Amino acid sequence: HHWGYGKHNGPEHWHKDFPIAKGERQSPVDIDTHTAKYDPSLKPLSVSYDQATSLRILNNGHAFNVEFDDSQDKAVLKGGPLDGTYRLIQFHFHWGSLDGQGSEHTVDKKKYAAELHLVHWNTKYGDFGKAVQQPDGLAVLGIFLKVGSAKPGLQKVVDVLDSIKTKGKSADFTNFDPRGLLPESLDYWTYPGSLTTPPLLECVTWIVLKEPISVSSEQVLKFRKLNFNGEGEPEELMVDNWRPAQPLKNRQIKASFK
Ligand SMILES: NS(=O)(=O)c1ccc(CCNC(=O)N2CC(=O)N3CCc4ccccc4[C@@H]3C2)cc1
Ligand SMILES: [Zn+2]
Questions:
Q1: Residue 138 CA: which ligand is closest?
Q2: Distance (Å, rounded) from C-alpha 9 to C-alpha 21?
Q3: Any idea which residues are catalytic in this one?
Q4: Atom 17 (ligand 1): residue with closest C-alpha?
Q5: Residue 74 in contact with residue 131, Cβ under 8 Å?
Q6: How many angstroms separate the Cα of 145 from the Cα of each of 127, 180, 232?
Q7: CB 77 within 8 A of CB 139
Q8: Rounded to an integer, what is the distance from CA 148 to the centroid of its chain?
Q9: Domains, the chain, with CATH or none
């Protein structure tokens, strides 16, 4: 009886196995744009993905992850609110059953069709597993998706999804350039938070870009054909794999922009 996003094992149940679900710095949150304050102390954000080496794409039963070689400082996130160097290890998405829901963060309570999370770990902790035990261990770059024009840089991901339909399937996924998933502007909001899936560890500096990327209806329809189940199990479509907004508590959301 494992956690998931069904009626019986969804986010409202997670606190029974993971009591930190009701903690002081949980994610995601609603970003109230009128309350977020410009912070002139934020240093410029540095997304350096030119040498990123993707390896594999995996259906883990909760989402699909594109994994990177993180055994040296090829693809790194620095600057903004961050101290030191954060290495890209994987990206994944959260999405809905309908275009009006799917994002984890919300903006003035608006839900987007989907949300991309580029996950990075603080190299001062040596490995990912040590980093998630630290309050500044991870930096997640969050990017909203809205349905409109196709995103050409997403199509290589969309076209491999038929090969990883079910939980536990993986496929080789080399030479994918995550620069193709970024919006034009790097203006962002930032706050201290958590993983949005169990174990819900409070280890993340969140950096949420203001400008959404546009994907086509056909692109997101292909996400919604994935399965939560393994092969040879009853088919359950992988949709609505998002955690709703959590209490902000004793936190301030800071804006990089005026
Ligand atoms: N919604 S979210 O962005 O808040 C979110 C981000 C991250 C996570 C943790 C997901 N776990 C992971 O991504 N894992 C776990 C791991 O132990 N390893 C071993 C180290 C290694 C080496 C190479 C590639 C991949 C891993 C994986 C990464 C959960 C949720
Ligand atoms: Zn995520």
A1: 1
A2: 14
A3: 62 (proton donor/acceptor)
A4: 129
A5: no
A6: 30, 13, 32
A7: yes
A8: 20
A9: 2-258 (3.10.200.10)
Torsion from C-alpha of 65, 77, 174, 60, nearest 10 degrees:
-10
Question: Of the residues 8, 13, 34, 62, which is catalytic?
Answer: 62
DSSP 88-115: EEEEEEEE-SSTT---SSEETTBPPSEE
Two tokens, residue 92: 């994944």
> Which experimental approach was used here?
X-ray
- Secondary structure (H, E, C), 42-90: CCCEEEECCCCCEEEEEECCCCEEEEECCCCCCCEEEECCCCCCEEEEE
Residues 6+ apart with CB under 8 A from 129: none
Our answer to whether residue 62 is catalytic in this structure is yes
127 CA distance to ligand 2 middle (Å): 19
CA gap 220, 97 in Å, rounded:
9
Q: Is 150 within 8 Å of 215 (Cβ atoms)?
A: yes
